[PDB]
Amino acid sequence: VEVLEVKTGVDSITEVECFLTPEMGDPDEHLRGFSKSISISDTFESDSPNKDMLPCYSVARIPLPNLILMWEAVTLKTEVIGVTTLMNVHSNGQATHDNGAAKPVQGTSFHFFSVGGEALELQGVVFNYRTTYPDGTIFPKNATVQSQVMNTEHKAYLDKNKAYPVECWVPDPTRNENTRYFGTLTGGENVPPVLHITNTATTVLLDEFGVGPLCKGDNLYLSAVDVCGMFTNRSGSQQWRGLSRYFKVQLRKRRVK
Amino acid sequence: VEVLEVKTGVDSITEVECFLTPEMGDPDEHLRGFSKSISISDTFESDSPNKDMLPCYSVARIPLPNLILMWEAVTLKTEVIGVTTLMNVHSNGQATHDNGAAKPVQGTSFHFFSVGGEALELQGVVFNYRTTYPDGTIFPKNATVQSQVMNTEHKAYLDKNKAYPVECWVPDPTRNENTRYFGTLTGGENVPPVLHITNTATTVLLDEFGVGPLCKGDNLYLSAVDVCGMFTNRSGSQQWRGLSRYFKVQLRKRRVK
Amino acid sequence: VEVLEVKTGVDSITEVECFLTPEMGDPDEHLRGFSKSISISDTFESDSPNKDMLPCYSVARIPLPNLNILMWEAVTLKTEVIGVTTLMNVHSNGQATHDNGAAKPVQGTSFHFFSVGGEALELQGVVFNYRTTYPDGTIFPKNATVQSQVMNTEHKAYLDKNKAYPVECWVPDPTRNENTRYFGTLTGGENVPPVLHITNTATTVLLDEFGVGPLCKGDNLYLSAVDVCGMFTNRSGSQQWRGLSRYFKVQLRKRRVK
Amino acid sequence: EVLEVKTGVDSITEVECFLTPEMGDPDEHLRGFSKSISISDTFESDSPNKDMLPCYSVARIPLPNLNILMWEAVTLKTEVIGVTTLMNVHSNGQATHDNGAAKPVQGTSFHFFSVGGEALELQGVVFNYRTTYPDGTIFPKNATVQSQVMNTEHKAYLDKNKAYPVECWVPDPTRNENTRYFGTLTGGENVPPVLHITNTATTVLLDEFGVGPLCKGDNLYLSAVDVCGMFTNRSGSQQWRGLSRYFKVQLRKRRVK
Amino acid sequence: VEVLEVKTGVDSITEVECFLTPEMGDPDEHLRGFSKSISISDTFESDSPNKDMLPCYSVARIPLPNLNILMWEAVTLKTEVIGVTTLMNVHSNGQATHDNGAAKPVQGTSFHFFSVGGEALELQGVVFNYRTTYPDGTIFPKNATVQSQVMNTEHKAYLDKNKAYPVECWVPDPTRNENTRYFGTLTGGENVPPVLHITNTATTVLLDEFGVGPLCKGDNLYLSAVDVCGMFTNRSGSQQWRGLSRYFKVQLRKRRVK
Ligand SMILES: CC(=O)N[C@H]1[C@H]([C@H](O)[C@H](O)CO)O[C@@](O[C@H](CO)[C@@H](O)[C@@H]2O[C@@](O)(C(=O)O)C[C@H](O)[C@H]2NC(C)=O)(C(=O)O)C[C@@H]1O
Ligand SMILES: CC(=O)N[C@H]1[C@H]([C@H](O)[C@H](O)CO)O[C@@](O[C@H](CO)[C@@H](O)[C@@H]2O[C@@](O)(C(=O)O)C[C@H](O)[C@H]2NC(C)=O)(C(=O)O)C[C@@H]1O
Ligand SMILES: CC(=O)N[C@H]1[C@H]([C@H](O)[C@H](O)CO)O[C@@](O[C@H](CO)[C@@H](O)[C@@H]2O[C@@](O)(C(=O)O)C[C@H](O)[C@H]2NC(C)=O)(C(=O)O)C[C@@H]1O
Ligand SMILES: [K+]
Ligand SMILES: [K+]
Ligand SMILES: [K+]
Ligand SMILES: [K+]
Ligand SMILES: [K+]
Ligand SMILES: [K+]
Ligand SMILES: [K+]
Ligand SMILES: [K+]
Ligand SMILES: [K+]
Ligand SMILES: [K+]
């Protein structure tokens, strides 16, 4: 399709505002936003994580006003919601030293968001190809030792919530022409969360040709991961803790051939 | 309201200058700027922090010269006051190693400020929905497991000083059109404070259309949190320590219809 | 080479898109992307690392559409480390950070490097310890002397073979490489956290200060990479380097030369 | 009223000097160091020895006599002098581990400098209002518990060298209109010094109206603090270590009414 | 000197390209690039470091094409630390970070410094401890007093000899050096990770605020450096400074002066 001119007039712009909840595993009715405590396999070959222990990608498909014109996503404001919850250092955590406050949430984090006019395209890569991923997840199939670095058979769409585990999928850099994505992995058991909030920062979604994601079938795709670190229980057991992400996207009508 | 032209001339600008004190809990008559020492609950479900153990958001409502014209906030200079107090490593503390100086204030910090033409709008998010917040604080009511990630029932206004606990409220990104807010949470038990001071830095408060916060009823709302970290006593017990925040805001008269 | 005008027209541009797999040592059939566990010699004179223990530079020579004097000129690069989220696997027979805790994540010394050129990357040999014996099957600084620990100009090579040039004994030669653009960061320390950014919105321009990108001799583009992310610690305490693949997308245009 | 700048080869001058640190100087061999740091048992009993307290440095520099013209400070180059001294890890130190080199200078730092046309204006803030500041220092008088966050009674001028302790005074952000100040407090017991040197970096001292500090009575005021960290002796006792600061200021003649 | 116009034409420009080796002490014939292991004095007054334990400033005086009034003006610099990947040798008589682990990498206090000038770098002496006795064969602050621990204006010198001026007791004199451009960073702490970037795409402009670079008196260019990367800990726990070489490429042009 050739991309032609932008429509103007009051009717030619719309905005989407929503939040995506994290999908950390939710091991019971009290533990939304947390994973199951992490257990370590006894051998490398026997790695077999339970579903409730695996954070997954979040995705939302947002219907847009029914419209060839297509909605074009132009700008994004985004923010992690509830950053201050990490100041709760009194809820049966593990004291940092005798008589001290509880160790706060810290350690490995992944903060990721994307906006596209279609599902985020994923490529599978595994730390350990002999990992058995659990029933109820969607994972790289027929994994081989090459899957530990790059196996081009592992292609997928982020088209279901609570399904695609964070650890075995990444955005496919060979695709995603119609999505804009951004992510940071910060590894290490002691890394401090650094979480900024403001309502004054905007990301522009236009490519080098001045064209944003074009929304196929009048749907906008939002995806996110916000694993903030791990919470350490009094006992020493550790659980991933996630937070929700706010999205505000401005869109305009674009004519295409 | 339609936003029209800025008024000019001698009478057309004013400035507000003030400071907001921190509200860290103030557990006795000698401990202004500190919280009660932190105790950890025996079970996750039994989390029940004392009011004096909970830092709260600070807020001041500043009356402006009586004026349709509205005062429009254009610029901000702001600074944390008393940064050098953290060099007192010679009292009541715990030696870092044998014969050493006292461990300084360090660990989790939250530094936050906002300027608006009405009260800061808040969204409640809790680390643990079964936490019992104490009498005398304003907290998310009817919390459910969903409140651990996002429950849209928890809406409030920062309309009372020394009342809204930092750990269960954040600025609501879905509102606050008439406020500009900025915050950073830095977690981890050993993170060092890094506090910059200068009288040469200005933040511009105008939005993408050149319009700043417009002060309803001729009132300016300033809000802050500056939890710098925790002080460690000889025994190992820890108390939050906060500092005051300076604000200087320049405003101009704006006609609206 | 007198560089003259760029060609225009639909036929005058092309793109290369590919990935380079990491070459960390691959000690057995199950450990692609990992090195052999690291052992330490008791003296400098007895340093004799096995090949499987040594990360090597990755390189690919990519044939371009045949020309002919026109040369393909590399103008822009998008690049990304592939599989960053694998580092969230803290459940696979690692070493618990404390009693009942999750496994220690991959961390420690990293080297992230990539280059795009119109010919093989030119290397200079430098060694931590001149008495290290590099193993059969690797290409290494020959006739090393104690001066090789700081600079010995005899140690010149081309990155012309995959999984052969060990990362620790070669660097890009700053005295050469006029027809390549290279970028690298070494972050040392046993506890340093990986910080890995991904996005499809970032482009690096490959043009020099005169507006000229690498010119592809014999219609070949050379891509090189190292992405040692840190070390994985096993339950036993033994440590292995872990690497990831790197994606490259390069835009090229036809340039006339004299 | 600020009017035009004078031109001509005679319309400019410069000041070049250095300010020595004032760390306490506990004996004839320990210039640049404080006395070893001890820890009082309680806030109430806190009574630091004069030789244990770093103080602000200040110099009042007479300028060429003018009279209405004033000297206007336009640019600053500044540098910490002697950064490589911190590579002496072989002198009376505490080995980091068996057979190791000495632990280097590290921990809490405060780096601060200012250039003004009159004395730096100070605001008193104290970590602990019951601290008894020693004879020979100038400190907040009639401190109350409110002095721990903000007590507007504690106003002073930095008008004497070796006298104003760093820990109980900061620049007063409510004043200092005729000064430019810059500082960073980096806390934590183990934080590493990061000290940059170059002769290629210039700070412009002009405000948003294009006006620099105007030198009242033809005096320029320079102030500094450069507490680099603490030096740990073999026994583990710790002392503040400071370094001198270079200033080069360019000034021009400005007419005023 | 009044500075007048730049000369143009093919003959009006020249380049200097070289490397400066680190001078860390070189305690024996196998340890070029390292210092002697660091020992600690038991008092301030007894501090008496041996020469081979003291890193020194590196300097090269580079003769330029003879001109005579014209002077060579240094305009741009490209510079790089050479051999950054040697720090990935964590298998050579180091100290395991934990049982069965790899060796602790080079880390801790670093100083990275370079300068380009039209005359010798001007130095100011400052000492950690004025009672330190600096060794025979070094050039050090003479007649040191307690004031030498903060600032003693007697301690003025020129960086005019290689392997001679210890890093720890000398810095560039900010009160002079008008005809030099210098840049340095000291990163302290015993555990700080080295962070070393390499690229052939970065240039530093040496022109001052008037558009004038360093002017080469007597047609000599002065290059100086220090690259103490950190300390290497051997198996016994003893620690030695480790340094690396620095590459310089400087472009110069002819400038008329009066
Ligand atoms: C935030 C929170 O709810 N923390 C609690 C955790 C948490 O619910 C689970 O770890 C989620 O996976 O549970 C803690 O107690 C558990 C459960 O009862 C432990 O005592 C473990 O119980 C076992 O029965 C089990 O889970 O199978 C046996 C196991 O050996 C126990 N683990 C340990 C380390 O003792 C917890 O500490 O993990 C309580 C915590 O407040
Ligand atoms: C700066 C300061 O005032 N430090 C003192 C603190 C401080 O006043 C409180 O922690 C503020 O909440 O108190 C220290 O003593 C306390 C009581 O004064 C402890 O002994 C605790 O007393 C209890 O009664 C209590 O609940 O507060 C019982 C508790 O078991 C005690 N805790 C400990 C760790 O012993 C203190 O160390 O916290 C003295 C300190 O100088
Ligand atoms: C990711 C992975 O495969 N980890 C396993 C490693 C790994 O395969 C090798 O270290 C790669 O070089 O092996 C672990 O077990 C090995 C045997 O496979 C050890 O028991 C070591 O075996 C030796 O035979 C050997 O030289 O490799 C002898 C050596 O003494 C043993 N080392 C130790 C520290 O016990 C491993 O822990 O290294 C298992 C791990 O899951
Ligand atoms: K398995
Ligand atoms: K593509
Ligand atoms: K409760
Ligand atoms: K809104
Ligand atoms: K050998
Ligand atoms: K060259
Ligand atoms: K007292
Ligand atoms: K004021
Ligand atoms: K001596
Ligand atoms: K000078």
Given the helix and strand composition of chain A, which structural class is it? mainly beta
> Rg of chain A from C-alpha positions?
20 Å
How many separate domains of chain A? Answer: 1
CATH class of chain A: Mainly Beta
Could you say which overall geometry of chain A the principal axes of the C-alpha atoms support? globular
Q: Could you say which small molecules are bound to this protein?
A: a molecule of 2 linked components (SIA-SIA), potassium ion
Q: Assign a percent range to the helix content of chain A.
A: under 10%
Superfamily at the CATH H level of chain A? Capsid protein VP1,Polyomavirus
Protein name (chain D): Capsid protein VP1
Organism (chain D): JC polyomavirus
Family (chain D): Belongs to the polyomaviruses coat protein VP1 family.
GO molecular function, one term (chain D): structural molecule activity
Keywords:
Polyomavirus Vp1, Chain A; five-stranded antiparallel sheet; disulfide bond (chain D); capsid protein (chain D); virion (chain D); homopentamer; 37% strand; globular; binds potassium ion; 0% helix; mainly beta; 257 residues; binds a molecule of 2 linked components (SIA-SIA)
